[PDB]
Amino acid sequence: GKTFILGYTNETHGIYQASKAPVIIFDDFTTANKWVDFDFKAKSSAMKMVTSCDDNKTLLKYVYYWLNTLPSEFAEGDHKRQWISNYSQKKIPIPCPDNPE
Amino acid sequence: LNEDAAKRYIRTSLKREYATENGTELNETLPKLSPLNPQYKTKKQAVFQKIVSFIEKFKGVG
Amino acid sequence: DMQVYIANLGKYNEGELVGAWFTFPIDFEEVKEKIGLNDEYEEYAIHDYELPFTVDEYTSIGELNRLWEMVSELPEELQSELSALLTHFSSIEELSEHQEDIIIHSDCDDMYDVARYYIEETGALGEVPASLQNYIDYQAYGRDLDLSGTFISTNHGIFEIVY
Amino acid sequence: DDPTLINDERFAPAGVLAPKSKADFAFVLHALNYLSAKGRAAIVCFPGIFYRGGAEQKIRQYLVDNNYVETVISLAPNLFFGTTIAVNILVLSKHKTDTNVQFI
Amino acid sequence: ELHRQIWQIANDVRGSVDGWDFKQYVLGALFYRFISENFSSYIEATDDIKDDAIKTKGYFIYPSQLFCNVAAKANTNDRLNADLNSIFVAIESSAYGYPSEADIKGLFADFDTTSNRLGNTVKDKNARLAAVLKGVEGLKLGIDLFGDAYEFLISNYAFTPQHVSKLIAQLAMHGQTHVNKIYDPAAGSGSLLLQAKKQFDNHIIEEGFFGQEINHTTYNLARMNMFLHNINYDKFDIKLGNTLTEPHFRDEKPFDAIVSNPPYSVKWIGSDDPTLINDERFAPAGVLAPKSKADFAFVLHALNYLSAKGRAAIVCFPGIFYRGGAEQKIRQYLVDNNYVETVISLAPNLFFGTTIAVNILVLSKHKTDTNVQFIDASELFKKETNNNILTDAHIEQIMQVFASKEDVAHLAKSVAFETVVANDYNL
Amino acid sequence: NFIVLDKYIKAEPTGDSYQSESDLERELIQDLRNQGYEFISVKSQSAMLANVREQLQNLNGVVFNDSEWRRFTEQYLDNPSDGILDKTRKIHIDYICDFIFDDERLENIYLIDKKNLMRNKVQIIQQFENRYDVTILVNGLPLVQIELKKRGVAIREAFNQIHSENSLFKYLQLFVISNGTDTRYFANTTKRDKNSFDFTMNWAKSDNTLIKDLKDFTATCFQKHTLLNVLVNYSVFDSSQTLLVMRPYQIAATERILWKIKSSFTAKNWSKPESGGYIWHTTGSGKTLTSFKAARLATELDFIDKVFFVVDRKDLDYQTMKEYQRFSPDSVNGSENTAGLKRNLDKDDNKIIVTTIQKLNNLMKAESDLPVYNQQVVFIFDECHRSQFGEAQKNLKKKFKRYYQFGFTGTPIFPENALGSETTASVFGRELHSYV
């Protein structure tokens, strides 16, 4: 929803501290909200991380934008449900064969 | 005769205007050691009769 | 600690039965020279053991060295409760397929606290008004989380096998 | 597995028993026990009996391995006195086409 | 260390049923240990510890007149638990009836009846309460910090927390080296009465910590609660009964400090069936309290038993605010004289098994006259779960402004009497 | 001394030809009154309950009125809502009522005194109001029902013929069926084919001398200590629920074991190769049951502190433990390791410990002078000195001394089959009791 509740101290609590721009998922049963990690923030209880192995083709704010290329199947959260394989497999249109030029 | 607890007994005898076998902290005011099992009235009933004669003497006056 | 008493197929009568303790990994030849033979190669009578799981008396030693890799791969909170995970799964290989799906509540200890975690901390159902925050049933929601998913309760925390 | 229910008349073709607190596919195996070569079963389920580990995956595997299961039906929550969650309806038959109309 | 042995209690008693069933057995065994250790430390205060049945009837009567429980020669916990793991169960079922011999004087007794035999079979009962007594033996208590474990074990999840009780005590206690103290209607436990002698062993004992309580199973744990804290015996009582329908003591006396914690709006069908419209205490109000809101009946009962010197400190749910004219005229009679002095707001929740806040009325037959409606919403450290804890030197600010009628903003102040009769008597 | 006899007593026919149903009754009453019993006359049902509130007085030493006896009669002893199973459980498990007097003190009313069983007073009655019945009635309650037949009713059809009011005859534990020539006994299991004469029991002497007639059977088994020990200390109310009665060779072997313990403790013996002993009961026995009664009567015997029934694991520490959990309440695991087994050696009141010999060697080859050393410890092996002379045993002779090392064998390594190991010449010494 709103990605801002009040202040906490970001040290000595097993912190992930949000390095240079991965994205996240919310939630159990919600499966809709995404965020760019803004500067350096927490991992608060549901921020399961989606990021990239590859680092010369992706620029994963591109695929952050390309989550809005799939609100088609990601609009109907109906039953009690988790969609791990759905984002885990496929698909996305990609400008490959331009890797990584 | 423990003097602070003697003052305590004086104040309770002024408030009650009598005394009895109760007043359950009666043993540690007695001077050195009377909690023991072979109790030979040392000096339990003697000081008890002293203080009841005292409150008979100063009954209302003092 | 994670060991066996493996001797011997020779001496079926077991007159002064031998072969004491071997941790992992296991050589064939070192154990065979430790325990001797019956003039041929028939050994590994798995009589006694001490393992987090269950193994039969005819298991080959190569399968034991195979299983020990997957057992020692896991963290200690999994290794402390491998039989409890085996009450839902069927093998250590199948546990190794889904070894990241298991969510561990070290903080939560019972279903009331699991419901209170999913509601108050996460906000899985949404925002919680403060005047509503005390007037929310957790026991019925805990029962329906029990009957919806699959939760297992141990000494440490609560193991949640998610799909 | 305390009695001979791994080698009984009805749970043995499944290859395993239902787990220790989820009785529902034990009911559907008991259901497919008492059915001829002509009739059809129509039972209900809570929708949660979906994958629930390999112990339930192999029961679903044995159901789809033959042409036992035919049609599932979803219904809307709540629809019930005294619950919250939805339901599903399994329609089983020893009767072949074979395809699974998952009519929701 | 304190929390070491507190954690020993919190683990080493919980087996294997609901806590409100083995509550009685664990607390009875702990109470039996305290009777044993207290009577042994009495008779051995010269080192004839291992006793014998030669007990001296002329000396046997003297603690029965003094401590009121002469245990036995050899029925103490020190002897019963070394010679334990043996048939049978009801040695202690006799050895509870024998320390309740005690017919003279001031029994305060018939008391250990909560411990029973169930259980399903008698050898299972033997093994289980043998394990209970052995676990009581396995505690590192020595010699004087005994009742802390009792106050911890009575605090279970299911009770009037110690800092709020300390606040109620400190409000009713300043500038008063007088007598008697202290009365309590609906005491519940002996918790909120106990913070007097937590401080007031200093000058002198004054009189007995009086009290009256309704529920008999709570009455037993209350009578042992202020027994374990080394408190003397003769007047230090609680009488069983309801305070509204069966009031005592009317005869003795107008007090000089009272505290309470009444439950929220218990029902009582009294109005107006007896002569409580023309009784000794409800008649100056002009009406009785309504049919399910008992709380101002408690505060009228409170202002009944108070002298021309002392002061009342009671609590209320904050809802007793206007609630129609039947409550408006009670508030009118309270403010019509100079009865009420201050009210204090506290933050929600601050309680077990409750949601709403509280208020605290401080009443006095003592005049200035103005109503310092001294509030607090924070702090009130209500952060740590659940509302743990208004710490020390934190209620000292609350007592500090309470001292002489000060007027500090971001916080409350005095009002005018004409302003509060201009408004419709709020809180 | 013993229960199963060692000397053949004189058995003579005193005919009284056994084609009758009353002469053997008279002979049986004569023999039991020769054995110091008491025959009263109750041709009713209520006066039998009047016997209970007088015979129980001597056993408990306290006095009921009628009003306490109402409560004790209707709440505990003679519940109408109970059958045979819970009443048998009251005989063997819940035999004490924590009764509250009208004087308000809790006292423990017994039914059968099990520690000092000489106080348990017996009586004899016969039928009243079916076939002919004699009843040995212990402490007011009817316990043993002798049922008599003739020669025309054969021993197989003797049981097969016949399988509130009265409810008091549901306390019957045994049914000693006899005719005049053969005599068999059993407990409350009433099937046709399976609970025929095969599941019933021929009472016998020590080794193999079976007993058939009545007079010899009465001279052997119906002694006070003998029959009360058969009722009390040698019957297991299994949580099937089923009452199981031991075989006579089982009882004889258990008695030789426990008397060897009792004679060795009084003459300060331990760690001797003649202080042990061994049993050969091959199969068809329920060696679980014999070993369980040996260990259970060892634990209460107060001379000792620990009992290790210890085997070598090839799915035995799961199997026999499951047997001892069948005999429901109490037996402590040696599962699963040598860390927590030490916790089991710390714990008490459940002194039977079932571990493996490998965990014991893992404990004994290390861990530096364990503090459970000086206590009196009884080992019960399997694969005994007639099956091994193992390296664990010489580790034991190194470390422990205050042990009574007994064992069982299935097939003994005799000199006749000495292919595997040695004989028993310096490990357990003498053989104690056998069956073949």
Curated annotation (Swiss-Prot), chain A:
Transmembrane segments: none annotated. The gene is hsdS. This is Type I restriction enzyme EcoR124I/EcoR124II specificity subunit. Residues 1-101 are annotated as: Target-recognition domain 1. The chain holds residues 52 to 152 of 404 of the full protein. Belongs to the type-I restriction system S methylase family. It comes from Escherichia coli. Type I restriction and modification enzymes are complex, multifunctional systems which require ATP, S-adenosyl methionine and Mg(2+) as cofactors and, in addition to their endonucleolytic and methylase activities, are potent DNA-dependent ATPases. The specificity (S) subunit of a type I restriction enzyme; this subunit dictates DNA sequence specificity. The presence or absence of a 4-residue repeat changes the sequence specificity; a third copy of TAEL inserted at position 179-180 changes the recognition site from 5'-GAAN(6)RTCG-3' (for EcoR124I) to 5'-GAAN(7)RTCG-3' (for EcoR124II). It comes from the Bacteria. Contains two DNA recognition domains (TRD), each specifying recognition of one of the two defined components of the target sequence. The type I restriction/modification system is composed of three polypeptides R, M and S; the restriction enzyme has stoichiometry R(2)M(2)S(1) while the methyltransferase is M(2)S(1). There is an equilibrium between R(2)M(2)S(1) and R(1)M(2)S(1); the latter is methylation and translocation proficient but restriction deficient. (Microbial infection) Holoenenzyme interacts with Escherichia phage T7 protein Ocr; this interaction leads to the inhibition of the restriction activity, but may still allow methylation and translocation.
Curated annotation (Swiss-Prot), chain D:
Keywords: DNA-binding, Methyltransferase, Plasmid, Restriction system, S-adenosyl-L-methionine, Transferase. One of its GO terms (molecular function) is N-methyltransferase activity. It comes from the Bacteria. One of its GO terms (biological process) is DNA restriction-modification system. Type I restriction and modification enzymes are complex, multifunctional systems which require ATP, S-adenosyl methionine and Mg(2+) as cofactors and, in addition to their endonucleolytic and methylase activities, are potent DNA-dependent ATPases. The C-terminus is required for assembly of the restriction enzyme complex. The individual domains assume different positions in the enzyme, allowing the holoenzyme to regulate the methylase, endonuclease and translocation states. The type I restriction/modification system is composed of three polypeptides R, M and S; the restriction enzyme has stoichiometry R(2)M(2)S(1) while the methyltransferase is M(2)S(1). There is an equilibrium between R(2)M(2)S(1) and R(1)M(2)S(1); the latter is methylation and translocation proficient but restriction deficient. (Microbial infection) Holoenenzyme interacts with Escherichia phage T7 protein Ocr; this interaction leads to the inhibition of the restriction activity, but may still allow methylation and translocation. Belongs to the N(4)/N(6)-methyltransferase family. The subtype gamma methyltransferase (M) subunit of a type I restriction enzyme. In the presence of the R subunit the complex can also act as an endonuclease, binding to the same target sequence but cutting the DNA some distance from this site. Whether the DNA is cut or modified depends on the methylation state of the target sequence. When the target site is unmodified, the DNA is cut. The gene is hsdM.
Curated annotation (Swiss-Prot), chain F:
Residues 19-223 are annotated as: Nuclease domain. Residues 268-413 form the Helicase ATP-binding domain. ATP binds at residues 281-288. Residues 224-436 are annotated as: Motor 1 domain. A monomer in solution. The type I restriction/modification system is composed of three polypeptides R, M and S; the restriction enzyme has stoichiometry R(2)M(2)S(1) while the methyltransferase is M(2)S(1). There is an equilibrium between R(2)M(2)S(1) and R(1)M(2)S(1); the latter is methylation and translocation proficient but restriction deficient. Belongs to the HsdR family. This is Type I restriction enzyme EcoR124I/EcoR124II endonuclease subunit. It comes from Escherichia coli. The gene is hsdR. The chain holds residues 13 to 462 of 1038 of the full protein.
